[PDB]
Amino acid sequence: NSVQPPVKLESTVSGFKTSIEGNTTKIQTVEGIVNDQGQEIALVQTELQNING
Amino acid sequence: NSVQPPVKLESTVSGFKTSIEGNTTKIQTVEGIVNDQGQEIALVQTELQNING
């Protein structure tokens, strides 16, 4: 087919990409919050080992 | 015509969608558990500070 159309995939591919990049940004926000919560848990376990200690 | 979707893509699009909505539900369950674990860590830090203090 000419160019890159006979194409009905822009809304589905931009939707999947916005939801995959949205899920990757939510995963980076959650990996951020889970590395922060992992540092906060490690500070809360270091505090809880200082508190338990 | 060019209206209803391409050659074959319901299993791949429902597969990607069930895996993207599944990843978004796992991310909403993990954002749920990480907002709950962030509330638990904030409760646990606030408790560790009501405690440290």
Q: In 10 A of CB B41, how many CB atoms? A: 21
Q: Which amino acid is at A7?
A: V
Q: Which residue of A has its CA nearest to B19?
A: A20
Q: How was this structure determined?
A: cryo-EM
Say how many CA atoms lie within 13 Å of A40 toward its Cβ.
20
CB pairs < 8 Å spanning A and B: 49
Residue B16 in tokens: 């990607």
Question: Cβ contacts of residue B2 below 8 Å, gap of 6+?
Answer: A6, A8
Q: Testing the interface with B: which of A2, A3, A12 to mutate, by most B Cβ within 10 A?
A: A12
Q: Which residue of B has its CA nearest to A49?
A: B48
Q: What is the resolution of this structure in A?
A: 7.4
Question: Cβ contacts of residue A41 below 8 Å, gap of 6+?
Answer: B41
Q: In 10 A of CB B19, how many CB atoms? A: 14
